[PDB]
């Protein structure tokens, strides 16, 4: 009955709420995106990031805005953008930057 087209990638705002999103996962892997609404090279990977979400439904897809979350980007040490980050449990695992659809999809498989 409940079938919203609103994908499965998930928006975040409150920093504290963001931390609770990592405990809501538990053992299943998540993917964090840091994007801006003015970033050129990020526009080419933004729609695609979502496309992946529904495919790899096993993992959680979190989208973070740098401008609307100055505390988040500073805490996770964002510099290059678009920057993607993955988490299982807690602890870093891996991160990387740049506009690349291949590297993004391959990394999810490389981990899970």
């Amino acid at each position: 009955h409940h079938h919203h087209h609103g994908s499965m990638v998930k928006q975040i705002e409150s920093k504290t709420a963001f931390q609770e999103a990592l405990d809501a996962a538990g053992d299943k892997l998540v993917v964090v995106d840091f994007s801006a609404t003015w970033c050129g090279p990020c526009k080419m990977i933004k729609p695609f990031f979502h496309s992946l979400s529904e495919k790899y439904s096993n993992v959680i897809f979190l989208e973070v805005d740098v401008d609307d979350c100055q505390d988040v980007a500073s805490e996770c040490e964002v510099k290059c953008m678009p920057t993607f980050q993955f988490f299982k449990k807690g602890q870093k695992v891996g991160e990387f930057s740049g506009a690349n659809k291949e590297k993004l999809e391959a990394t999810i498989n490389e981990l899970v």
Binding site: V66, A73, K79, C80, M81, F96, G98
Partner: protein, 599 residues
């Protein structure tokens, strides 16, 4: 006789009855003419020393041979033997063997005088600890993967075109390698430096997963592919190989890449690409190199920071986090005060100042980080000085674009201002003059660092400043306001730079400093304390000489003949006032001799 001595092999009579399975294939290859003896997976502990001359390829693999059979003979050109529990090889091997493979074995050491006609020797996954001095010169391929070798011999066959040592336990490499070498693989070793002398025909050099800090400036011009990934590389060579095609320099500790990447040369058909992912770069470097590659006028090498197209983000982290980057000491008491320091205005400006200051290579140095840490403790308790440095940091953001150096100088100069307001300088005018001379020299240095940074791509303006300050500590007598610090590099400062900077500043002090002192500065704050009377009558001497002087009408009538300038006239007479007042108090004490030429 071959038939006899092979069915004789059943006379030792071990448990394995599969010994006859080998003599079956031994006869089948004689009549069918297989020109090769293929036998493995058998389980054979030993083989005869006699093989038919018809054979030329002998295969022993994946069955235990606890040791070698002494003196094999016949006509073997290639001998393969892997995955066996072997201990040693004989010195009596057929001098017709051209290729020999030994993988997953247990060889502890290599004997002497191996077959001359041997071109290929494979020794992967063994236990070789030492390598022989004189191996046969016909060798053209040597591989010792997964082999704990402390150090390689200085002499080598000099005809090897492919040497692989990627294994374990290498401290360094000899400076005398095979001149005919085109490929070297020294990955996964624990070496820290590369020899200044390398084969002049070398094309492929892989030194990944090591501990190299600096690549030698005397690198073979024939090198096309260089891999220095997974290292502790601080900088990159100014002189890259002439025929360089690709350089994998990721997983390193580069902060800024060399200034010698303009145009470079496309000696190769494929555009030269340099991959430098996962390195803590400076924002000035990433920006300027990206701005280079963005413009179509660029003809240099393509530097890859990401995968991956990107856009640099400017985000100011909270100040309580920005301060911990300078002081290593972690305590709950200290951090709490910095949050209270973050509450007042212009705190975010200073928070961004600290990050943009420590975003270079030379400012990450422990000796420089130590004095900044001390300077932060000075602001941690002195509430008055902490307020005025935030204002200076605030004006740094508005003033043009990137003036972090001058901002750092103004707040360091502001320390003397607050020392004068409280009155640390009383009758120590003779002592503050010397302090005034040093700060004057630093301003001259700052002006020199601005002229220098304009021809520099990645060298920060701070490093040029701290360079000139440290390199001229002895020459310009920077005893105070400067600590004896060691820097990783001179920051592009040449010999002619120091010889010129020295002379210019000295002459700038023999003529300008007298006036300079008067316009300065914190000294004034002493004048209103050490001589309140003269300071009041001076203020009453500028409004007295501005009411109806003749210089106004002389200029006002001169301006119209040419075509709020009265303030520009006001400052012209103020400088003359500060000069007159200074010389009066100077003669009051014995400090008047101090503002002599000095240099």
């Amino acid at each position: 006789e071959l038939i006899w001595s092979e069915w004789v092999k059943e006379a030792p009579a071990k448990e394995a009855a599969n010994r006859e399975e080998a003599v079956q294939r031994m006869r089948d290859c004689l009549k069918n003419n297989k020109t090769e003896l293929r036998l493995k997976i058998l389980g054979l502990t030993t083989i005869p020393a006699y093989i038919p001359e018809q054979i030329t390829t002998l295969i022993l693999d994946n069955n235990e041979l606890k040791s070698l059979p002494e003196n094999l003979q016949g006509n073997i050109k290639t001998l393969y033997a892997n995955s066996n529990q072997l201990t040693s090889i004989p010195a009596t091997l057929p001098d017709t063997i051209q290729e020999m493979e030994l993988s997953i074995n247990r060889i502890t050491e290599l004997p002497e005088r191996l077959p001359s006609a041997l071109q290929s020797l494979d020794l992967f996954h063994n236990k070789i600890s030492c390598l022989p001095e004189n191996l046969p010169e016909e060798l053209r391929y040597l591989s010792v993967y997964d082999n704990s070798i402390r150090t390689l011999p200085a002499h080598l066959p000099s005809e090897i075109t492919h040497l692989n040592v990627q294994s374990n336990s290498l401290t360094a490499l000899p400076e005398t390698l095979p001149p005919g070498l085109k490929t070297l693989e020294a990955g996964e070793n624990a070496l820290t430096s590369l020899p200044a002398s390398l084969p002049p025909e070398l094309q492929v050099l892989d030194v990944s997963k090591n501990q190299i800090t600096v690549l030698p400036e005397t690198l073979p011009p024939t090198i096309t592919t260089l891999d220095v990934s997974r290292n502790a590389l601080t900088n990159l060579p100014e002189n890259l190989p002439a025929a360089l095609q690709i350089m994998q320099a990721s997983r390193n500790n580069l902060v800024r890449l060399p200034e010698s990447l303009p145009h470079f040369r496309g000696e190769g058909p494929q555009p030269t690409r340099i991959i430098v992912e996962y390195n803590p770069f400076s924002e000035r470097t990433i920006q300027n190199m990206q701005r280079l590659m963005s413009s179509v006028d660029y003809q240099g090498p393509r530097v890859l920071f990401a995968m991956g197209d990107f856009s640099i983000v400017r985000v100011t982290r909270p100040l309580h986090q920005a301060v911990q980057g300078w002081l290593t000491s972690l305590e709950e008491e200290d951090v709490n005060q910095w949050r209270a320091f973050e509450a007042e205005a212009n705190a975010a400006a200073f928070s961004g100042f600290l990050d943009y200051l420590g975003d270079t290579q030379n400012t990450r140095h422990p000796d420089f980080k130590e004095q900044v840490s001390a300077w932060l403790m000075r602001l941690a308790e002195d509430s008055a000085l902490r307020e005025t440095v935030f204002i200076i940091a605030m004006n740094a953001t508005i003033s043009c674009e990137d003036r972090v150096t001058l901002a750092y100088h103004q707040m360091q100069e502001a320390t003397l201002v607050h020392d004068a307001e409280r009155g640390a300088f009383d009758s120590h005018l003779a002592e503050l003059i010397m302090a005034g001379r040093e700060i004057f020299r630093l301003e001259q240095i700052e002006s020199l660092a601005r002229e220098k940074v304009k021809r520099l791509f990645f060298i920060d303006e701070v490093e040029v400043f701290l360079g000139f300050q440290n390199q001229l500590r002895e020459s310009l007598s920077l005893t105070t306001m400067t600590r004896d610090m060691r820097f990783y590099n001179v920051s592009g400062i040449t010999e002619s730079d120091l010889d010129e900077a020295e002379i210019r500043i000295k002459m700038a002090e023999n003529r300008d400093f007298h006036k300079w002192f008067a316009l300065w500065g914190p000294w004034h704050k002493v004048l209103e304390r050490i001589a309140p009377e003269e300071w009041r009558e001076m203020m009453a001497k500028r409004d007295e000489c501005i009411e109806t002087d003749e210089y106004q009408s002389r200029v006002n009538a001169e301006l119209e003949d040419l075509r709020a300038i009265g303030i520009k006239i006001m400052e012209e007479i103020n400088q003359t006032l500060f000069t007159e007042i200074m010389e009066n108090i100077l003669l009051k004490k014995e400090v008047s001799s101090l503002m002599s030429a000095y240099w």
